[PDB]
Amino acid sequence: EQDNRFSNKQKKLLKQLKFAECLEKKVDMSKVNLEVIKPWITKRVTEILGFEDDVVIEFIFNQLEVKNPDSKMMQINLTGFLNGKNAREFMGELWPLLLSAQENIAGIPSAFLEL
Amino acid sequence: VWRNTEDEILKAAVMKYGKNQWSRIASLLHRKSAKQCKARWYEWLDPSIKKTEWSREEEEKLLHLAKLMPTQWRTIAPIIGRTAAQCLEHYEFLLDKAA
Amino acid sequence: SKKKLRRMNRFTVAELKQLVARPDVVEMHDVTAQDPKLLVHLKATRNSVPVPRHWCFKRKYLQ
Amino acid sequence: RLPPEVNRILYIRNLPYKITAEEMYDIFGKYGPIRQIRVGNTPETRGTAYVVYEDIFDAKNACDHLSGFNVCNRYLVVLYYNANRAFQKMDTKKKEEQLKLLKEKYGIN
Amino acid sequence: MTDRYTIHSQLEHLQSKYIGTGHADTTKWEWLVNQHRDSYCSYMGHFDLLNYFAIAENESKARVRFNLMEKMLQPCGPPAD
Amino acid sequence: AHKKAIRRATVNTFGYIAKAIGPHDVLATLLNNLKVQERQNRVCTTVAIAIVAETCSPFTVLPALMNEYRVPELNVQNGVLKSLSFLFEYIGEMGKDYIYAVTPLLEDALMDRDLVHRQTASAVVQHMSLGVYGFGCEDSLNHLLNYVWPNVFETSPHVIQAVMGALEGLRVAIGPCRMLQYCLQGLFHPARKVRDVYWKIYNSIYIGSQDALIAHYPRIYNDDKNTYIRYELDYIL
Amino acid sequence: CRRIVPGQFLAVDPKGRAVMISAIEKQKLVYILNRDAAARLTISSPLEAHKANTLVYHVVGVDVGFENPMFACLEMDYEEADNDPTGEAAANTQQTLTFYELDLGLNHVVR
Amino acid sequence: MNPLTKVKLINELNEREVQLGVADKVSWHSEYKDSAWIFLGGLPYELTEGDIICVFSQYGEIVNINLVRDKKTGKSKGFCFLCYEDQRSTILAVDNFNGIKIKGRTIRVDHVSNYRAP
Amino acid sequence: DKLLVDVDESTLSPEEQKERKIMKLLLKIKNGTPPMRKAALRQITDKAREFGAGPLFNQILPLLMSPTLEDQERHLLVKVIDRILYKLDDLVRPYVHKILVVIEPLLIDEDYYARVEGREIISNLAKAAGLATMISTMRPDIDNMDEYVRNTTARAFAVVASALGIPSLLPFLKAVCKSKKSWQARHTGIKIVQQIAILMGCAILPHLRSLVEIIEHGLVDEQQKVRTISALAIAALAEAATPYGIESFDSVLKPLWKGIRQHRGKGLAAFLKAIGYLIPLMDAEYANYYTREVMLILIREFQSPDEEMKKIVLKVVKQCCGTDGVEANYIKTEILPPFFKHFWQHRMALDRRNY
Amino acid sequence: AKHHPDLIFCRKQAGVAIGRLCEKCDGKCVICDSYVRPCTLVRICDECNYGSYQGRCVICGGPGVSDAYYCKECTIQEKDRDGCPKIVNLGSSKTDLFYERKKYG
RNA sequence: AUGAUGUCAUACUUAUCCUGUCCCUUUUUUUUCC
Ligand SMILES: [Zn+2]
Ligand SMILES: [Zn+2]
Ligand SMILES: [Zn+2]
């Protein structure tokens, strides 16, 4: 904002991290039902953590409810709470499920279409 | 403490003024008094003082004396020819090398 | 080494002296520039002013 | 009635090297119960000892009385310990298992 | 290291608040590309290079203006790779 | 004094009593102070000579300064240099009469006598250019550029930022063409210390007067894939 | 005639409450305008709309009645054609008309 | 602002007037010279009158005591009003007892201006 | 104490141990003449990268936690942390929580310069170790069980919010302050919001509505504490957004104004502060009704003993009874007499802010 | 102030609020740090002008008493065109001298 | 022929200091009762 002697650490990670695979196809949120996903997110993380962390839950929710989310930024922000590779796998697992739900006509992922 | 630069300026002053005018010599130096100029000349800088290693005659002397007149180094010292600080450090030195 | 690939890019001085239009301008280390063709073209422009002699010298300047 | 920097663990230097553990124990049990004792081993720590008492008052009046004790031609230099950092993790598994014992036994929930 | 990335910091700052500056790692492409873009924005400001150009070709000042602002998105080829 | 109010007021009253009496005697007792050793008093006497010269016209006190620059001490040579720095910043636009008297002193100082000699002659050049901006005293300033420019590879914070100030004063007074003719050859150098310095200087020429440069850039040919030449500037009409 | 310094485009809003001055790239300011007691013109401090890597083709004040003033920028975004080693994004990058809207109650300019 | 700050501030009032060197006649207590009532607050909920009196009688005879307890359960709300026999004892008590720990709870004292009976 | 026993270096085959000893020139910094301090400072700030973070903070931090450390020593030690924090930019990524655990107490401290320095190094810390590190590091302390660390973490949070930007931190806020298991987290999030308003000041306007909606779920909550802190945060926000944002606060004039009447005690003071700060920000056809309603409560609180009560009504009176939309005679008749009877006392003079 | 490299400016957009000087700071420029030929007045960022910050020394931070100007040299090189030149950080020297004193007496 | 390392003081540079001020530290078992 006012300082020059510090670098943008986000951009630095934007260069120097190892990211997930589905993180390219931009995604909109109008086309999505979330309240179907929400329990999936909850159980996913709660297992990753062995306990429940409401704040991480709501963090992911709030980062998603935007018009179009940045998968890069989201993987970064979860890298702290989860163990880094867990974040890569988790995001590259949810984001394709997002693509599925969004090309679905009801907006729901094919996993819960089947189940 | 004293630095090579002060020491050489002292040597030159003394060699011009002589060894009783310590007050003008002390005027020549900054952060130095005549008391301290005099002490330095007569402790280390004087070319009469010898900085060699002890002949073992000198060390048998040192030991005999420092037993006969214990703790009296300004009295012991001229009887062997080095300053009291040298006699004293070298005496403790022999004592601990022997201990 | 990708450094040595950039080194595999590094023309020989006669390579440079050949391609460029004015070869006098080319000095020794000019080969080591990440843009040698630019560099020599800019050294051959009119009215410009060459770098000061003492950038390589190990002693400093009027020291 | 204590100032908080009082500890049940004190740091001692100016010990005789190689000093007999039994002496250590009774010299220090001239005050009360000693929970534990450690003597330094690497030459850097050689000659000093951490002593862990089992009683606050024991440790404190030891630091009151013995500080300024002369054995073996040297005064025993003491101080309170500042246990201000941890040095390894507190082992969640056995921790939760012994508290699971607590709860299973005493029927809280 | 220290000086390296701290002046890399100050220069990222300079540039990002001032498009067009450089650093020790500035390439021929981006140099000449900023140099072209500035040239265009100034042909458009200056009311008389705009005449000169509209008279040298045979267009109208609005079309010439439109063409410049079209070119201003890749004036020197595609990027380096 | 330890307080800056007192020293500021003291310098002002040197000016006033120089206005009452002539300049000569107060100016002589002020060159003598440049013979002391603590810097704060000498920097304050350096500002007092500037003030005396600006109240009672500079042509009275210049010959005595320029002559005092011939006595063999470090501190008095830097005293008269710093005094000129202040004096040119004060007189402003009337520099144009003394610029020619002064320059042979500055080139003499810019060919080293010390790091601080070059640092203070660079400050003099900065203020002298900002003052003589607009009056065609430009060959003098270019000649001094030839001496200020080699100090570009320095590393002392104070010498390097004095030289930077000088180069930006000279940018407004000599214009950005000259400055770019000086920056060109080292922007794409083999080394990297020299690229660092040259890109810092070029950024400062660019930021201020980035529009005047459109007319100044050199012609850079087009290679195989991209087209680097600006053709609109070769339309004839 | 700089490139990120406003001055090239100058739009106003029809009811006469604000002006917006804008550069060909990266900077837009919005000034607010009022009468005083003595009904003389008094002008505020600038708001801001700076957005990076966006040329501007034209700006104009959209007409709305005493809501928040609105300005209608043509635009573009050279940011990708800067980063497309082939020339793909050079074509198939298209303008986007965008409306900016003051918020005089809240005193900032939202896109 | 929790009651521990209201303790800290009364103590600050005292030691500040000390630093300023105020005469005993323009002490901030002088504004209260017509009321022998102090308020105690922060009291623990198990202390009774007997305790409040055995504690606060150190500075005089206590004429009236009013421990305010919630009417439904009868249990103390945790504050009291206390009427000394001489106003000067209220001076003493406010200076001396404000901030003492009784059973961990650090009780607080201050005068009362225009007490209304219950 | 390791400095006392002296033995040859090459005996210490750990070069980690050699650099350990040579870095205990920390003593020469802590105690020392100004020449020693200057030289040792330059040495450490040049050799920082080679020394590495680990060794450094492992020696430096116990010092800062020492119980007998006086003022100048602490100022020097935190200046050391500052410079090495600027030289090592990323490498602090594992030590951020330790640095915080030590620096946070500077944020609630009586020495104004201690607060400003702590604020400044926490800012540089937030910039150096980026957002995700700070978030992950200080999350588990929102839910802590010591009010001490809840408070200082809240303030630190507001500092990293100032340094990194609200828009980047705002989702995390929404999260914590809407956490439903624990009301401690709700309290602490609302309090972070208050501190942001206190610190960033003017710069909250673009996000004002987002913050107010974050917070308005608190004015209705049943646990009295978080109600009070939400009212305080509303007053802070209004003060940081003087005249503006009134249409953002619009949603919230109702919970206050009814809480006023059917409240009594401390919540009354808090809601009074809030409504008082909004009263300026309001258009006359609102302020007249609200004012003439509020002054009724005010006149009653002129006799309040509570010190926070009295201070709040002083502020309020200044705002309410000092607009363009009141009439002199009402004041002269109804405010002045009990104003001068209850406020001009000696206790007030004696206090420093009430003065 | 061209003397202390450790400090920083607000640098954010200008306004209409004139700038003010403390009595220690009275009379000098705000960048060039000169004492002469002041030409134009200072205008400060609204944020750095809001609330408690009104009427203070741009440089010192104390009680502002006089209007700040720019020297003719800053005006000619156009260094007056960068938005709020308020130093937003205290520096080492203020707290340093303060601590040396508070130890001394 | 100017190397780095230096717990070497000296010499120098910065109209730097030497007056600038404490006010947003109030944080805990809601509690001043007709
Ligand atoms: Zn000031
Ligand atoms: Zn200036
Ligand atoms: Zn500002």
Nearest CA in chain J to A3: J8
Q: Is the CB of I267 under 7 A from strand K?
A: yes
Q: Which string of b and e fits D30-64 if b means at least 16 CB within 10 Å?
A: ebeebeeeebeeeebbebbbbbbbeeeebbbebbe
Helices A38-49, A85-103: axis angle to 10 degrees equals 170
The distance of I111 to chain J (nearest Cα, Å) reads 10
Q: Is the CB of I266 under 7 A from strand K?
A: yes
Q: Do I130 and I160 touch, CB atoms closer than 8 A?
A: no
User: C62 to chain F: which residues are within 8 Å by CB?
Assistant: 111-112
Q: Do G81 and G57 touch, CB atoms closer than 8 A?
A: no
Domain membership of residue J62 (yes or no) is yes
The kind and range of the H/E element at G9 are strand G9-12
Q: Is the CB of H70 under 7 A from strand K?
A: yes
- Nearest residue to F168 (alpha-carbon basis) of F206, F137, F138, F140: F206
Q: Are strands H108-111 and H105-106 parallel, antiparallel or unpaired?
A: unpaired
J39 in a labelled binding site: no
What Å value separates CA B46 and C1' K3?
37
Domain membership of residue C4 (yes or no) is no
Structure tokens at I264: 């009594």
- Nearest residue to C50 (alpha-carbon basis) of C25, C13, C24, C33: C25
Could you give phi then psi for residue A109, rounded to 5 degrees?
Answer: -70, 155
Kindly give, in sequence order, each residue whose CB lies less than 8 Å from that of residue A15, ignoring residues fewer than 6 positions away.
none
- What are the distances in angstroms from CA A27 to CA A31, A96, A97, B30, G81? 9, 10, 11, 79, 22
CA dihedral B84, B89, B95, B99 (to 10 degrees): 170
Q: Three-state DSSP class for A33?
A: coil
CATH number at residue D16: 3.30.70.330
Sign (positive/negative) of CA torsion I133, I139, I142, I146?
negative
Domain count for chain J, please give it.
1
Domain membership of residue D100 (yes or no) is no
Domains and CATH numbers, chain A: 9-114 (1.20.1390.10)
Domain of J45 in residue numbering reads as 8-88
In chain F, positions 145-184 with C-beta closer than 7 Å to nucleic chain K are: 158
Kindly give, in sequence order, each residue whose CB lies less than 8 Å from that of residue I235, ignoring residues fewer than 6 positions away.
I270, I273, I274, I276, I277
Structure tokens at I280: 């300026």
Helices F99-110, F115-132: axis angle to 10 degrees equals 150
Q: Are strands J20-21 and J38-41 parallel, antiparallel or unpaired?
A: unpaired
| Interface residue of I45, I51, I89, I90 to substitute, partner E, most E CBs within 10 Å | I89
Domain of C49 in residue numbering reads as 9-63
- Nearest residue to C62 (alpha-carbon basis) of F154, H41, F216: F154
User: G44 to chain J: which residues are within 8 Å by CB?
Assistant: 16
Could you give phi then psi for residue I222, rounded to 5 degrees?
Answer: -95, -30
What Å value separates CA F99 and C1' K14?
27
Domain of E46 in residue numbering reads as 15-79
Domain of D60 in residue numbering reads as 3-82
Q: Are strands H76-84 and H101-102 parallel, antiparallel or unpaired?
A: unpaired
Q: How far apart, in whole angstroms, are the C-alpha atoms of residue F10 and residue F6?
A: 6
CA B82 to centroid of chain Cα atoms? 7
Q: Three-state DSSP class for F94?
A: helix
Q: How far apart, in whole angstroms, are the C-alpha atoms of residue I4 and residue D13?
A: 11
Q: How far apart, in whole angstroms, are the C-alpha atoms of residue I146 and residue I144?
A: 6
User: E1 to chain I: which residues are within 8 Å by CB?
Assistant: 49
In chain H, domain spans: 3-118
Structure tokens at D76: 């025993």
Q: Which residue type does H10 have?
A: I
| Number of Cβ within a 10 Å radius of residue G46 | 21
Strand partners, D12: D49, D78
Domain membership of residue C47 (yes or no) is yes
Ligand 3 center to J56 CA (angstroms): 12
Q: In the PDB record, what is the listed experimental method?
A: cryo-EM
Residue matched to tokens 């750990």: I14
Structure tokens at I328: 């002199």
Nucleotide closest to H117 measured between CA and C1': K34
User: A15 to chain E: which residues are within 8 Å by CB?
Assistant: none
Q: Do C40 and F190 touch, CB atoms closer than 8 A?
A: no
What Å value separates CA H97 and C1' K34?
29
The distance of E3 to chain I (nearest Cα, Å) reads 9
Nearest CA in chain E to C36: E28
Domain count for chain C, please give it.
1
Domain membership of residue C62 (yes or no) is yes
Q: What is the per-residue DSSP string for D43-67?
A: TTTTT-EEEEES-HHHHHHHHHHTT
Task: Output DSSP code: residue G111.
Answer: -
H and I interact (at least 3 Cβ pairs within 8 A): yes
- Nearest residue to F151 (alpha-carbon basis) of F126, F177, F188: F126
Could you give phi then psi for residue A6, rounded to 5 degrees?
Answer: -125, 150
For strand K, give the nucleotides within 7 A of a protein CB: 1-3, 7-34
HSE-CB at A58 with a 13 A cutoff on CA atoms is 15
The kind and range of the H/E element at D75 are strand D74-80
CA dihedral F42, F44, F50, F56 (to 10 degrees): -110
Q: Three-state DSSP class for H101?
A: strand
Nearest CA in chain J to A4: J8
- Burial (0-12, 13-18, 19+ Cβ within 10 Å), F48: buried
CA F180 to centroid of chain Cα atoms? 19
User: I89 to chain A: which residues are within 8 Å by CB?
Assistant: 6-7
Q: Is the CB of H100 under 7 A from strand K?
A: no
Q: Do H71 and H60 touch, CB atoms closer than 8 A?
A: no
Q: Is the CB of H26 under 7 A from strand K?
A: no
Could you give phi then psi for residue A9, rounded to 5 degrees?
Answer: -70, -30
J25 in a labelled binding site: yes
3-state percent helix, strand, coil for chain B, nearest multiple of 5: 70, 0, 30
- Nearest residue to I350 (alpha-carbon basis) of H109, H10, H111, H2: H10
Domain membership of residue J34 (yes or no) is yes
CA dihedral I223, I226, I229, I233 (to 10 degrees): -130
User: I247 to chain G: which residues are within 8 Å by CB?
Assistant: 105-106
Structure tokens at F151: 């100090």
Q: How far apart, in whole angstroms, are the C-alpha atoms of residue C47 and residue G90?
A: 37
B and J interact (at least 3 Cβ pairs within 8 A): no
Domain count for chain D, please give it.
1
Q: Three-state DSSP class for I313?
A: helix
Domain count for chain E, please give it.
1
Angle subtended at Cα B46 by Cα B40 and Cα B51, rounded to the nearest 5 degrees: 100
- What are the distances in angstroms from CA H85 to CA H30, H60, H62, H96? 17, 7, 6, 17
F and C interact (at least 3 Cβ pairs within 8 A): yes
Q: How far apart, in whole angstroms, are the C-alpha atoms of residue G73 and residue I347?
A: 62
Ligand 1 center to I38 CA (angstroms): 28
Interchain pair F210, G1: CB under 8 A? no
Residue matched to tokens 């779920």: I217
- Nearest residue to I85 (alpha-carbon basis) of I111, I121, I137: I121
List chains adjacent to chain J, taking adjacency as at least 3 C-beta pairs closer than 8 Å. Answer: A, F, G, I
Q: How far apart, in whole angstroms, are the C-alpha atoms of residue I232 and residue I154?
A: 15
* Residue spans of alpha helices (H) in chain F: 4-20, 24-33, 39-55, 58-68, 74-91, 99-110, 115-132, 138-148, 157-174, 176-183, 193-207
Q: Do F130 and J76 touch, CB atoms closer than 8 A?
A: yes
Q: Which residue type does I213 have?
A: E
Q: How far apart, in whole angstroms, are the C-alpha atoms of residue I101 and residue I112?
A: 20
Q: Which residue type does D35 have?
A: R
The kind and range of the H/E element at J44 are strand J43-44
Residues across chain H: 118
Nucleotide closest to I263 measured between CA and C1': K30
Q: How far apart, in whole angstroms, are the C-alpha atoms of residue E1 and residue A61?
A: 39
G with I: how many residue pairs have Cβ under 8 Å apart? 17
Q: Do I210 and I165 touch, CB atoms closer than 8 A?
A: no
Kindly give, in sequence order, each residue whose CB lies less than 8 Å from that of residue C54, ignoring residues fewer than 6 positions away.
C60, C61, F150, F153
I126-155 residues touching A, CB cutoff 8 A: 127-133, 135-137, 139, 142
Domain membership of residue D97 (yes or no) is no
Q: Is the CB of I226 under 7 A from strand K?
A: no
Q: How far apart, in whole angstroms, are the C-alpha atoms of residue H44 and residue F183?
A: 81
Q: Is the CB of I75 under 7 A from strand K?
A: no
- What are the distances in angstroms from CA E1 to CA C62, E6, F44? 30, 8, 41
Q: How far apart, in whole angstroms, are the C-alpha atoms of residue C39 and residue A96?
A: 49
CATH class of H3-118: alpha beta
Q: How far apart, in whole angstroms, are the C-alpha atoms of residue H87 and residue H64?
A: 13
Q: Is the CB of I1 under 7 A from strand K?
A: no
Nearest CA in chain I to D43: I5
- Nearest residue to I151 (alpha-carbon basis) of I188, I106, I126: I188
| Number of Cβ within a 10 Å radius of residue F123 | 23
Q: How far apart, in whole angstroms, are the C-alpha atoms of residue I61 and residue D85?
A: 10
